[PDB]
Design an enzyme around this catalytic site. Structure first.
Site, mmCIF file in Angstrom:
data_model
loop_
_atom_site.group_PDB
_atom_site.id
_atom_site.type_symbol
_atom_site.label_atom_id
_atom_site.label_comp_id
_atom_site.label_asym_id
_atom_site.label_seq_id
_atom_site.Cartn_x
_atom_site.Cartn_y
_atom_site.Cartn_z
ATOM 1 N N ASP A 153 12.040 1.075 8.538
ATOM 2 C CA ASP A 153 11.455 -0.254 8.661
ATOM 3 C C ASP A 153 12.047 -0.968 9.859
ATOM 4 O O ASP A 153 13.204 -1.385 9.832
ATOM 5 C CB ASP A 153 11.672 -1.060 7.378
ATOM 6 C CG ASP A 153 10.826 -0.559 6.228
ATOM 7 O OD1 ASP A 153 10.021 0.378 6.431
ATOM 8 O OD2 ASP A 153 10.963 -1.111 5.116
ATOM 9 N N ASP A 209 0.996 -1.432 -3.527
ATOM 10 C CA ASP A 209 2.293 -2.089 -3.635
ATOM 11 C C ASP A 209 2.289 -2.916 -4.905
ATOM 12 O O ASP A 209 1.393 -3.739 -5.119
ATOM 13 C CB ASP A 209 2.539 -2.984 -2.424
ATOM 14 C CG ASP A 209 2.834 -2.190 -1.175
ATOM 15 O OD1 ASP A 209 2.047 -1.289 -0.840
ATOM 16 O OD2 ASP A 209 3.872 -2.453 -0.537
HETATM 17 N N1 LIG Z 1 9.085 -6.517 2.532
HETATM 18 C C1 LIG Z 1 8.335 -5.457 2.227
HETATM 19 O O1 LIG Z 1 7.104 -5.435 2.303
HETATM 20 C C2 LIG Z 1 9.113 -4.225 1.755
HETATM 21 N N2 LIG Z 1 10.393 -4.185 1.408
HETATM 22 C C3 LIG Z 1 10.671 -2.925 1.057
HETATM 23 N N3 LIG Z 1 9.578 -2.163 1.179
HETATM 24 C C4 LIG Z 1 9.471 -0.704 0.880
HETATM 25 O O2 LIG Z 1 10.372 -0.273 -0.169
HETATM 26 C C5 LIG Z 1 10.403 1.171 -0.062
HETATM 27 C C6 LIG Z 1 11.819 1.715 -0.156
HETATM 28 O O3 LIG Z 1 12.627 0.902 -0.990
HETATM 29 P P1 LIG Z 1 14.190 1.020 -0.842
HETATM 30 O O4 LIG Z 1 14.621 0.124 0.398
HETATM 31 O O5 LIG Z 1 14.532 2.524 -0.407
HETATM 32 O O6 LIG Z 1 14.910 0.660 -2.076
HETATM 33 C C7 LIG Z 1 9.951 1.532 1.364
HETATM 34 O O7 LIG Z 1 8.663 2.172 1.288
HETATM 35 C C8 LIG Z 1 9.874 0.174 2.065
HETATM 36 O O8 LIG Z 1 8.861 0.172 3.077
HETATM 37 C C9 LIG Z 1 8.598 -2.954 1.609
HETATM 38 N N4 LIG Z 1 7.338 -2.600 1.859
HETATM 39 C C10 LIG Z 1 6.692 -1.603 0.987
HETATM 40 N N5 LIG Z 1 5.245 -1.600 1.169
HETATM 41 C C11 LIG Z 1 4.920 -0.912 2.418
HETATM 42 C C12 LIG Z 1 3.626 -1.521 2.907
HETATM 43 O O9 LIG Z 1 3.677 -2.557 3.568
HETATM 44 C C13 LIG Z 1 2.292 -0.844 2.503
HETATM 45 O O10 LIG Z 1 2.558 0.468 1.987
HETATM 46 C C14 LIG Z 1 1.206 -0.827 3.622
HETATM 47 O O11 LIG Z 1 1.494 0.058 4.726
HETATM 48 C C15 LIG Z 1 0.952 -2.259 4.128
HETATM 49 O O12 LIG Z 1 0.652 -2.359 5.492
HETATM 50 P P2 LIG Z 1 -0.670 -3.178 5.903
HETATM 51 O O13 LIG Z 1 -1.031 -4.094 4.653
HETATM 52 O O14 LIG Z 1 -0.438 -3.952 7.142
HETATM 53 O O15 LIG Z 1 -1.801 -2.058 5.984
#
Ligand SMILES: NC(=O)c1ncn([C@@H]2O[C@H](COP(=O)(O)O)[C@@H](O)[C@H]2O)c1NCNCC(O)[C@H](O)[C@H](O)COP(=O)(O)O
Length: 244
Positions: free
Chosen positions: A129, A10
């Protein structure tokens, strides 16, 4: 076929970061995004889940850096963050990534999303999500700031449109090392014929073994972030665990 593992990268300002439940004040930093990606590849990753958090949060872009990372990697990349129109979709795919995730766009422009699904097929997965409050499963968009409707209705709509794949996050478990939501994962997997990728909360090798029990029901893979960066376990340990 064993559970596929997708180490997450990320990206905020070119850096590999983690958050606890997406909150700004909880950020931990782990060096450059390129070094993180190449490091997981070296350890044997088949896939990298590469996310533009700045784009997801609508506060900027890391697109050029992410394009370089995809270019440098030999393995497959699932690229995500801010893919919400034809320009941003084509720019993501032009990196040569294996597939993309759309999230917010499935909530805000279902018509566009359906047409993208219809023309791009296996190269487009939809990120779901989920926030569960009093048994109510709601989707969240725009970095989790917006309500995106009922999970189950939207899931059925996307499934009917022929959505190739779903990436399912319990936002309450994300970045907590509190364990995955196995009930949510099963619930989604049982309601679509499309493969499901688990995301968020993995805290141990046992957590990965638990997710692996759902593979026969449709849980094809698991994205792992904090547990790897915080050194709960190593990637080879994880790769071995999903086979034992
Ligand atoms: N508030 C946030 O963390 C967040 N906000 C948006 N996203 C991501 O933005 C991406 C899509 O963006 P758009 O809404 O389509 O413009 C999606 O993959 C969505 O999950 C977010 N997370 C993106 N990161 C996903 C993870 O969290 C990572 O990939 C691991 O799975 C972490 O999990 P863990 O540390 O517990 O193992």
């Amino acid at each position: 076929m064993p559970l596929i593992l997708l180490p997450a990268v990320d990206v905020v300002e070119g850096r590999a970061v983690r958050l606890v439940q997406g909150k700004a004040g909880s950020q931990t930093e782990y060096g450059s995004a390129v070094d993180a990606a190449l490091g997981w590849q070296r350890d044997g990753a088949e896939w990298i889940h590469l996310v533009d958090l700045d784009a997801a949060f609508g506060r900027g872009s890391n697109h050029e850096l992410l394009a370089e990372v995809v270019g440098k990697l030999d393995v497959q990349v699932e690229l995500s963050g801010g893919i919400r129109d034809d320009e941003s979709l084509a720019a993501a795919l032009a990196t040569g990534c294996a597939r993309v995730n759309v999230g917010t766009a499935a909530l805000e422009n279902p018509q566009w999303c359906a047409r993208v699904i219809g023309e791009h097929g296996d190269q487009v997965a939809v990120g779901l999500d989920v926030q569960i409050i009093d048994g109510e499963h709601r989707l969240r968009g725009r970095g989790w700031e917006t309500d995106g409707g009922d999970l189950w209705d939207v899931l059925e709509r996307l499934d009917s449109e022929g959505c190739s794949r779903f990436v399912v996050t319990d936002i309450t478990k994300d970045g907590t090392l509190g364990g995955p939501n196995l009930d949510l994962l099963a619930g989604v997997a049982d309601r679509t014929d499309a493969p499901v990728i688990a995301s968020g909360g993995v805290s141990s090798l046992d957590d990965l073994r638990a997710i692996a029990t759902l593979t026969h029901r449709g849980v094809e893979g698991a994205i792992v972030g904090k547990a790897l960066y915080a050194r709960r376990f190593t990637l080879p340990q994880a790769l071995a665990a999903v086979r034992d």
